[PDB]
Design a protein around this ligand. Sequence first.
Ligand SMILES: [Mg+2]
Ligand SMILES: [Mg+2]
Ligand SMILES: [Mg+2]
Ligand SMILES: [Mg+2]
Ligand SMILES: [Mg+2]
Ligand SMILES: [Mg+2]
Ligand SMILES: [Mg+2]
Ligand SMILES: [Mg+2]
Ligand SMILES: [Mg+2]
Ligand SMILES: [Mg+2]
Ligand SMILES: [Mg+2]
Ligand SMILES: [Mg+2]
Ligand SMILES: [Mg+2]
Ligand SMILES: [Mg+2]
Ligand SMILES: [Mg+2]
Ligand SMILES: [Mg+2]
Ligand SMILES: [Mg+2]
Ligand SMILES: [Mg+2]
Ligand SMILES: [Mg+2]
Ligand SMILES: [Mg+2]
Ligand SMILES: [Mg+2]
Ligand SMILES: [Mg+2]
Ligand SMILES: [Mg+2]
Ligand SMILES: [Mg+2]
Ligand SMILES: [Mg+2]
Ligand SMILES: [Mg+2]
Ligand SMILES: [Mg+2]
Ligand SMILES: [Mg+2]
Ligand SMILES: [Mg+2]
Ligand SMILES: [Mg+2]
Ligand SMILES: [Mg+2]
Ligand SMILES: [Mg+2]
Ligand SMILES: [Zn+2]
Lengths: 37, 23, 133, 136, 126, 176, 192
Amino acid sequence: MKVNPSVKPICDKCRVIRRHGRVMVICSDPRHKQRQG
Amino acid sequence: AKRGRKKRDRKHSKANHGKRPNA
Amino acid sequence: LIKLQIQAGQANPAPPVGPALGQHGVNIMEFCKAYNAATESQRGNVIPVEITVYEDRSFTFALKTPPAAKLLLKAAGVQKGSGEPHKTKVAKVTWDQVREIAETKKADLNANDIDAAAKIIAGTARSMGITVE
Amino acid sequence: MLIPRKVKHRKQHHPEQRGIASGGTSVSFGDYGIQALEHAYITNRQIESARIAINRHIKRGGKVWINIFPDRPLTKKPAETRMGSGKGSPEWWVANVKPGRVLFELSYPDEKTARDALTRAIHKLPIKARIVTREE
Amino acid sequence: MAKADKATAVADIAEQFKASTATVVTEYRGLTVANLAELRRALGDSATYTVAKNTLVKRAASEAGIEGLDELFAGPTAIAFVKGEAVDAAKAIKKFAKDNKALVIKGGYMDGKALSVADVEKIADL
Amino acid sequence: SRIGKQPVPVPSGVDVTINGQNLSVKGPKGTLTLDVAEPISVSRAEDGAIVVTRPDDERRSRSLHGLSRTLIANLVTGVTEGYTQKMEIFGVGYRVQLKGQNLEFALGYSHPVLIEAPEGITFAVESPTKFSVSGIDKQKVGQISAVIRRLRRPDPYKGKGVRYEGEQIRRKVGKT
Amino acid sequence: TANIPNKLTANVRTRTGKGASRQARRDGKVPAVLYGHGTDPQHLELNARDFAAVLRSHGTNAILTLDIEGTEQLALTKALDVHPIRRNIQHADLLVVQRGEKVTVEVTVLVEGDATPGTLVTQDANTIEIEAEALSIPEQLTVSVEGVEAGTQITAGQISLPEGVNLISDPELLVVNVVEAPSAEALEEEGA
RNA sequence: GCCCCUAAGCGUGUGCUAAGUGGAAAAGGAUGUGCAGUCGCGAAGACAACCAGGAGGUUGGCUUAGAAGCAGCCACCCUU
RNA sequence: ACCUCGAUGUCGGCUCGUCGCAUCCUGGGGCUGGAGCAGGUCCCAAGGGUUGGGCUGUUCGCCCAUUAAAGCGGCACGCG
Ligand SMILES: [Mg+2]
Ligand SMILES: [Mg+2]
Ligand SMILES: [Mg+2]
Ligand SMILES: [Mg+2]
Ligand SMILES: [Mg+2]
Ligand SMILES: [Mg+2]
Ligand SMILES: [Mg+2]
Ligand SMILES: [Mg+2]
Ligand SMILES: [Mg+2]
Ligand SMILES: [Mg+2]
Ligand SMILES: [Mg+2]
Ligand SMILES: [Mg+2]
Ligand SMILES: [Mg+2]
Ligand SMILES: [Mg+2]
Ligand SMILES: [Mg+2]
Ligand SMILES: [Mg+2]
Ligand SMILES: [Mg+2]
Ligand SMILES: [Mg+2]
Ligand SMILES: [Mg+2]
Ligand SMILES: [Mg+2]
Ligand SMILES: [Mg+2]
Ligand SMILES: [Mg+2]
Ligand SMILES: [Mg+2]
Ligand SMILES: [Mg+2]
Ligand SMILES: [Mg+2]
Ligand SMILES: [Mg+2]
Ligand SMILES: [Mg+2]
Ligand SMILES: [Mg+2]
Ligand SMILES: [Mg+2]
Ligand SMILES: [Mg+2]
Ligand SMILES: [Mg+2]
Ligand SMILES: [Mg+2]
Ligand SMILES: [Zn+2]
């Protein structure tokens, strides 16, 4: 779970979601899982 | 640095019209 | 149902061949002897062989024709292809060799006639960059 | 690092930051260019950083133009010294960039790679900037 | 895909039918381009084997008396225009369906009649 | 919305009661309750259908519409058929048994572990390794299935633990 | 070359000045000045949106029919005032024309073609000068590049001119310069 | 300045915001949302989803233990 | 160079503490170039705890034995 002020779709399987007022990225690969913060 | 921020920002009071003495 | 390219008078190397289909569960010795007999009935060409694999491990060899670029490399007489196709024109290819290679690849192609095969061969020679006139 | 060969006066006043660019406001050499949005001083190192960033990206072919030269100097006086006792000595060589100016110019076949290269360049700059083509 | 390209395809398929003596409509869902290209070797000798979008075909089929083939557009549409002689395409498709078993023939058309599987097999035998 | 504009059919073995925004459905599997939101209007088409309607197409209306429609559809499907989930476990000596209604697992820890089927859900073990869970509520069935799945830590190396059947686990190789 | 005149409505300005111009730009009106051989300067206002659309459709050098209080007048877009930053249209310059008039016009040249892969082509002269007729001014002049190799210099002469079209610029202008593509080494050398 | 502290408006009409933003802040990141606008495709049925394919030359040439559509470089071609 | 020169005592150490978390240990997680053991890095977490000596006025630093650990900081570089 990366936590960075920037979040980007590393691979095209990545999707960008907003949960509870914060932006994160979900993907099948757990490496690409990241959060904007 | 908080105090300078406070004073320079209270300069923006609608009555002060963007100016206060001593910045 | 896998594919490899193996030379005319060569068989049983460790890196390219052995583990390549030994992890496919296929008998390597019988394939080696049969392909060797067939390719020494060819006498002259590196051949792409396709292994067709079954559940009981029985195998069948599909002997397509020697590769079109390899056929053009042996056709133009040069051992090595070009490093910069259309810029470094190492050799030359004639339309009669084009027609012979067109017949062979007609045996290998989806081409219906000679001219389509010749055009395919022209594209193949261009891919590696040998002058075609 | 581009440094002017010689200057008539080595110690100058600061280049004043009022107004928008009048000249150099159009793309003139390459297919694309970078247009500046802020007021700034741009140093040697920023320019060479951005230029190497472009060159690494486009790699093979295409040519780049640099429309601005860092010929106005800026001095600094040695640290641990009080105020006064004369002006400092020049260290860093800058150019005065106003909004509307075009900084870098590119001639390259592919559009997407070009935009990516200019984006890599822009990220190296201290100012807001945008990509402008020769189409109106 | 744009409407101009669809109109061009409609006109061209109509023209190819007016040059065709009879037609066969089949389903291809479940075959690969390998055996399909082998079929184009087989069918490309005399007839013509193609595939078109049904909404394109019905504007292409409204031209001639193949307006009776609108009800055979259900499922993927593979059209065999028999140009050389008449029966070649039917028997070739019948043998290709016997070997593959992945084809279903929606029907055929000729002589002012659109005809079902049994009648096509009759003409394929006759 | 787009989903929320498909009527919910009422099969014959189904009984429906509507009280304003409240809804209740009774069938062979039992009775279930539901409540819809203020923006959404609920009607029963006398042809044995359910109609979900919204006055507006703003954010709240659009989002809530399909939600409510699918929710009532799930509610009726629960009392018509029900809900069934399948579990199946991997690992040597990984033991699953039923004690009455309660489920017992032995997944390699020193002690065995127990889980209790809440009211409205039942367990059925047919193999020592795999079993199933039946229930009225889709949400409750999913919840219990999830908590069952969570019991053992995921293993990309040897893949020990409980699994759903359809799911596939990512697996790396510990080379060293 | 026969292009249709474009129909725009103009209304004569009531006030002139920076305040009037700012006010007019504020509500979607663009100020223009009509001056020609008629020696009558008209300060007019145009719809910004429609004028911009006409410009986009038919380039910078477009021939216009203006509706000065019912009067249909032929005019030419002699010059445009664009903001350097937000790309508006600030002011327009319109030249009265009668049919069959010799006109001096900047026309954009566009380079199309497939140069050889080891070639980079640079478009050096952005726009070229033409003497033509008011009703027959091109929108673009096309230069084709195929098989261009080594240093292939295309000057202003080689551009094909249709009937009634005359080249005013000196034909030496390198409109397109064909050069060797810069190397992976050459790029790391310029600017250092 | 006008809800109460605290004198005067929990004023009227049309919108906007969900962040207590209001009632501090950068590069930069981001399917929040409103308004307005340009281009594409779309009933000849568009997009999404549901089902069938995505073949042959060929493993294109160099480099390479190795290079086969998937470390790298050049062209970026041909049939059904 | 804005308070203090008709006085605002200045380093280390001792006694006594109080607060911040930018967490040293203990607690909870995510990812791994995480087989296990043992790790790396990021997030949450301030309840409690965090040694005794040799040299140096020393701060600091090195060293000797241990410990789960021998945290960093502000409070007139706390406190005559
Ligand atoms: Mg980053
Ligand atoms: Mg500070
Ligand atoms: Mg000030
Ligand atoms: Mg001045
Ligand atoms: Mg300029
Ligand atoms: Mg100037
Ligand atoms: Mg910047
Ligand atoms: Mg009061
Ligand atoms: Mg008020
Ligand atoms: Mg009120
Ligand atoms: Mg009010
Ligand atoms: Mg606030
Ligand atoms: Mg901010
Ligand atoms: Mg951004
Ligand atoms: Mg291939
Ligand atoms: Mg490879
Ligand atoms: Mg004193
Ligand atoms: Mg005193
Ligand atoms: Mg004293
Ligand atoms: Mg203390
Ligand atoms: Mg913390
Ligand atoms: Mg922990
Ligand atoms: Mg951890
Ligand atoms: Mg603590
Ligand atoms: Mg407590
Ligand atoms: Mg402290
Ligand atoms: Mg003190
Ligand atoms: Mg201290
Ligand atoms: Mg002290
Ligand atoms: Mg004392
Ligand atoms: Mg003391
Ligand atoms: Mg004291
Ligand atoms: Zn991903």
